[PDB]
Amino acid sequence: STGSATTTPIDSLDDAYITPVQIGTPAQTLNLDFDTGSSDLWVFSSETTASEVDGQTIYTPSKSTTAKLLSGATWSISYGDGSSSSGDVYTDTVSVGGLTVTGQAVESAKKVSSSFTEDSTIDGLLGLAFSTLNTVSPTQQKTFFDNAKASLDSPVFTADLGYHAPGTYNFGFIDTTAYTGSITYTAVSTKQGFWEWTSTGYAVGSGTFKSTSIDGIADTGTTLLYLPATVVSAYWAQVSGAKSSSSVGGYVFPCSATLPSFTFGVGSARIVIPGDYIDFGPISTGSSSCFGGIQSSAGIGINIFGDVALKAAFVVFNGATTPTLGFASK
């Protein structure tokens, strides 16, 4: 089997991407944030605290003939940005882009933090990291990809995120028309439950490439590119007037600037992030100070190849017995 679904930016900055997901019978379609940095499929639901729902579409298990309470199971998750959610668990039929999993754990939110409530466009998350990170207790549950894997034509999914445009998540096949040149594959460590890999270095604009190992995670659920302070300083030093602002919470730059590109290494291959992808616009409405899309990972504890980086590539998440990651230009 295979599946193919379009993923769409939630706003003009590509702050996140939503992908329609069919849950239950008859289908209830919710728009979920596919997150390769976590491993819970959770949804706004009929059980969510009413005051914490503001415009989201909810899953109502009582209206699904295939929903079953997973008795005794609870979940609770906290994300790197400080947001969180928790609740109980149903199993139900879940389909993405024509690919169907029966008996998928659908985690129903009883509580969500303010950032979720305030984002009316995201109806939940669909985790695509390794199932060892799944938070369901006392019986850990599998991700949608893990459940689907054995049925897939090939045990892979791909992320093809757009810049200010829709893109695609495919399951079970590699679309050879979706990228240019060849795909370069690189080793993954699953020790922390992430799609963790080591970049071979970087360049700033037309500058020379610096060979240096940068361990980090491929994370579709993180907006920006978070790299070591040395790397980030070298990037922003090439933008007149750019500075790190503790009051704003990162690097800012004059909105009048033309940003240089940023290149990262994948083995002997190179992925180029155009300067425009690094512009996240005014820090507040009408400001001439703009927020940067490359930020320091210092104090996160891990480097994160978020959407800024991933959207410059066609990315293969290879879930074979020994997982690997592939990157191509596009």
Swiss-Prot record:
Does this entry carry the keyword Signal? Answer: yes
As its record notes, the protein acts as a catalyst of: Hydrolysis of proteins with specificity similar to that of pepsin A, prefers hydrophobic residues at P1 and P1', but does not cleave 14-Ala-|-Leu-15 in the B chain of insulin or Z-Glu-Tyr. Clots milk
| Catalytic residues as annotated in Swiss-Prot or TrEMBL | 35, 199
Alphabetically list the UniProt keywords. Answer: Aspartyl protease, Disulfide bond, Hydrolase, Protease, Signal, Zymogen
Q: Which GO terms describe its biological process?
A: proteolysis
The intrachain disulfides are: 255-290
Molecular function GO labels: aspartic-type endopeptidase activity
Task: Give the first-level EC class, as a single word.
Answer: hydrolase
Superkingdom of the source species: Eukaryota
* EC number(s) given by UniProt: 3.4.23.22
- State the family it belongs to: Belongs to the peptidase A1 family.
What protein is this chain from? Endothiapepsin
The protein's organism comes out as Cryphonectria parasitica
The opening ranks of the lineage are:
Eukaryota, Fungi, Dikarya, Ascomycota, Pezizomycotina
Tell me the gene name: EAPA
